[PDB]
Amino acid sequence: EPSCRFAHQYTQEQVLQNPSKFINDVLFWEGKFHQNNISYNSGNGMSYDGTNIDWVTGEGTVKHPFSAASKESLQVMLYAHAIAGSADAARFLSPNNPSAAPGIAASIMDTKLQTYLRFNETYPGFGGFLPWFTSSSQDLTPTWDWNNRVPGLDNGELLWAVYAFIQAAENTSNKSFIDLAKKWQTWMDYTKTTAAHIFYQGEGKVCAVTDIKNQSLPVYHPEQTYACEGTSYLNDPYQGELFTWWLQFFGGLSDADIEALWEYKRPQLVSVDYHIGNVGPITVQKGYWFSSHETWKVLEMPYYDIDIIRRVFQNAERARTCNSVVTQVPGMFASINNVTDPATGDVVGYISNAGIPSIANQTIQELDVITPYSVFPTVLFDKGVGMAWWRNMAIGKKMQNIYGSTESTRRDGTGVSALLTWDSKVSTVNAILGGVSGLVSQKMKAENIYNTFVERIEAEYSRVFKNLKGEHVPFCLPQETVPDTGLVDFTTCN
Numbered sequence: 389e390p391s392c393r394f395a396h397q398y399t400q401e402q403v404l405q406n407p408s409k410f411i412n413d414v415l416f417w418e419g420k421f422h423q424n425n426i427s428y429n430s431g432n433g434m435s436y437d438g439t440n441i442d443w444v445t446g447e448g449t450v451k452h453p454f455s456a457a458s459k460e461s462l463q464v465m466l467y468a469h470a471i472a473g474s475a476d477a478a479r480f481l482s483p484n485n486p487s488a489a490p491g492i493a494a495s496i497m498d499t500k501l502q503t504y505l506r507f508n509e510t511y512p513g514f515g516g517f518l519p520w521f522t523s524s525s526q527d528l529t530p531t532w533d534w535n536n537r538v539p540g541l542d543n544g545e546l547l548w549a550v551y552a553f554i555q556a557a558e559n560t561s562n563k564s565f566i567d568l569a570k571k572w573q574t575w576m577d578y579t580k581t582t583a584a585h586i587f588y589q590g591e592g593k594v595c596a597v598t599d600i601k602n603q604s605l606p607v608y609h610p611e612q613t614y615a616c617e618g619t620s621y622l623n624d625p626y627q628g629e630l631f632t633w634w635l636q637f638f639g640g641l642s643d644a645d646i647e648a649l650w651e652y653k654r655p656q657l658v659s660v661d662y663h664i665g666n667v668g669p670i671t672v673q674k675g676y677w678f679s680s681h682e683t684w685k686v687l688e689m690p691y692y693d694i695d696i697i698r699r700v701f702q703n704a705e706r707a708r709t710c711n712s713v714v715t716q717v718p719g720m721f722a723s724i725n726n727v728t729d730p731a732t733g734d735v736v737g738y739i740s741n742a743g744i745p746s747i748a749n750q751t752i753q754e755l756d757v758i759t760p761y762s763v764f765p766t767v768l769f770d771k772g773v774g775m776a777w778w779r780n781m782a783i784g785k786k787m788q789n790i791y792g793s794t795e796s797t798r799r800d801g802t803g804v805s806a807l808l809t810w811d812s813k814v815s816t817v818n819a820i821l822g823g824v825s826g827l828v829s830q831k832m833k834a835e836n837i838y839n840t841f842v843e844r845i846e847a848e849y850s851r852v853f854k855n856l857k858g859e860h861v862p863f864c865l866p867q868e869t870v871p872d873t874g875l876v877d878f879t880t881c882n
């Protein structure tokens with residue numbers, strides 16, 4: 389039903405008055421991303437990072453033929469809600485026939501597993517984990533750059549997504565869904581046996597990227613070896629923490645090794661106060677850039693069952709929203725693709741360092757480009773405010789298309805990234821669906837690791853975050869619009 393360019397059909401106040409109505413429109417158009425050659429390969433069930441869309445028409449042109457476990461996690465989390473019978477997930481997957489959404493999820497996940505298993509057989513050295521891969525042909529291959537290299541962070545995201553999906557499928561009592569779930573359990577369970585050998589260097593050090601001697605050799609072939617790539621470790625409270633939990637619960641580590649994990653992580657868990665102009669102080673968890681994407685972990689595990697954690701991450705959104713008002717930005721910041729060069733149709737590069745410098749480890753930041761997916765952590769606390777910010781950015785010229793929101797816009801409105809990715813679009817969708825932490829905590833309780841999670845994570849957070857400031861500071865609403873400098877809406881969405 390809804391117009392492609394629905395964002396400017398609403399006033400901001402109307403989004404706050406009925407978030408659900410607005411969100412219903414959002415999910416419909418975001419769902420159009422879910423098509424073969426746009427977001428995934430229906431032949432092998434594998435995600436693509438995304439695709440370029442034409443500068444003028446806003447139609448799909450040239451896909452990214454590569455992806456990673458990180459995008460798999462976003463896709464799998466969506467399918468977990470879909471197979472559970474979420475009406476919102478059905479709006480995305482199968483709006484014209486919602487009852488079909490579960491079977492669609494089941495079918496793709498079945499095809500997907502087969503591909504995962506063919507990859508494992510051909511490249512047993514990965515030990516059941518996924519590198520960055522090319523998904524444009526029936527069988528997966530590592531991208532050239534990622535031969536014999538595997539990232540802990542992206543896989544940590546995928547593993548808890550699959551964990552959630554298994555639970556959702558089993559919750560249906562549908563026999564074929566349970567059969568599918570058990571095949572995924574087998575895949576997931578295999579990673580438990582290889583995880584420490586591949587990623588755990590010892591003394592609490594976990595490889596960000598593991599270098600594999602030869603990906604064609606089995607994990608325990610006498611010649612196979614695994615070493616951390618340089619000196620980069622998963623030792624911080626961002627997305628990589630999902631993998632820490634994988635090692636702790638399933639890796640076969642000693643109690644001394646588990647204690648070492650948290651000990652080695654502890655110096656990167658830091659309290660700082662955001663305070664600029666009349667906003668703050670607001671006590672937050674110090675970010676890497678304070679890019680929104682750094683908060684990904686709360687989508688996958690029940691961090692917000694712990695009140696101190698819930699309060700610290702609520703403060704994050706006080707700072708995030710109000711930072712953009714006080715610095716007069718018509719959006720918020722996260723790691724994102726840069727603008728398209730209209731002359732070439734190519735994205736000029738990737739902007740990693742986009743966040744909030746004053747509350748960030750990495751203070752040298754590029755803040756000329758804003759993205760709708762920056763709202764995903766806000767959405768978790770307040771759908772209305774989240775969607776108000778989403779709308780403010782989506783109103784920008786070319787910031788909607790026939791596949792939903794566009795990747796990013798310059799905050800001065802002189803350029804746009806004419807691109808679609810899971811990262812910039814379905815991160816928000818998953819936040820709207822409430823993450824998969826519910827499903828995960830169910831299965832964690834059933835497997836009796838829930839209490840350990842709460843105890844450990846409440847201990848670590850309660851130990852550094854005392855005497856929080858700024859908990860009375862309300863979330864801020866957008867006060868500036870994206871300038872119209874002459875860019876013209878896509879001709880298929882205006």
Ligand SMILES: OC[C@H]1O[C@@H](O[C@H]2[C@H](O[C@H]3[C@H](O[C@H]4[C@H](O[C@@H]5[C@@H](O)[C@H](O)[C@@H](CO)O[C@H]5O)O[C@H](CO)[C@@H](O)[C@@H]4O)O[C@H](CO)[C@@H](O)[C@@H]3O)O[C@H](CO)[C@@H](O)[C@@H]2O)[C@H](O)[C@@H](O)[C@@H]1O
Nearest residue numbers: 437458459539542597624626627676682684738740809811
């Ligand atoms: O899909 C979007 C876009 O991705 C482009 O790749 C980027 C990459 O983005 C990915 C990133 O995760 C990567 C990880 O970076 C770490 C940060 O996420 C983390 O917050 C930080 C602090 O702990 O530490 C960083 O090292 O590093 C790994 C490589 O060693 C990657 O395997 C991993 O994907 O964020 C998301 C994870 O939640 C990913 O979904 C996202 O793709 O970030 C790199 C560092 O900023 C950057 O150099 C790279 O260009 C990709 O090039 C582009 O084609 C895609 O459209």
Ligand SMILES: *[C@@H]1O[C@H](CO)[C@@H](O)[C@H](O)[C@H]1NC(C)=O
Nearest residue numbers: 508509512516574575578606
């Ligand atoms: C992956 O391959 C290994 C070694 O070839 C095998 O033992 C393992 O069971 C496979 N993993 C899965 C989930 O099938």
Ligand SMILES: *[C@@H]1O[C@H](CO)[C@@H](O)[C@H](O)[C@H]1NC(C)=O
Nearest residue numbers: 536601602603604605606611
């Ligand atoms: C990796 O192992 C495969 C499988 O035996 C072999 O064919 C290939 O030559 C090896 N590559 C290197 C660089 O040793």
Ligand SMILES: *[C@@H]1O[C@H](CO)[C@@H](O)[C@H](O)[C@H]1NC(C)=O
Nearest residue numbers: 726727736737738739740803
């Ligand atoms: C993004 O593009 C702008 C030009 O629009 C350029 O000045 C900036 O350095 C670019 N940044 C990256 C990381 O590509």
Ligand SMILES: *[C@@H]1O[C@H](CO)[C@@H](O)[C@H](O)[C@H]1NC(C)=O
Nearest residue numbers: 655656657674748749750751
């Ligand atoms: C960033 O984090 C590292 C690792 O904990 C720390 O040693 C360094 O001092 C931090 N730098 C800043 C500017 O926060």
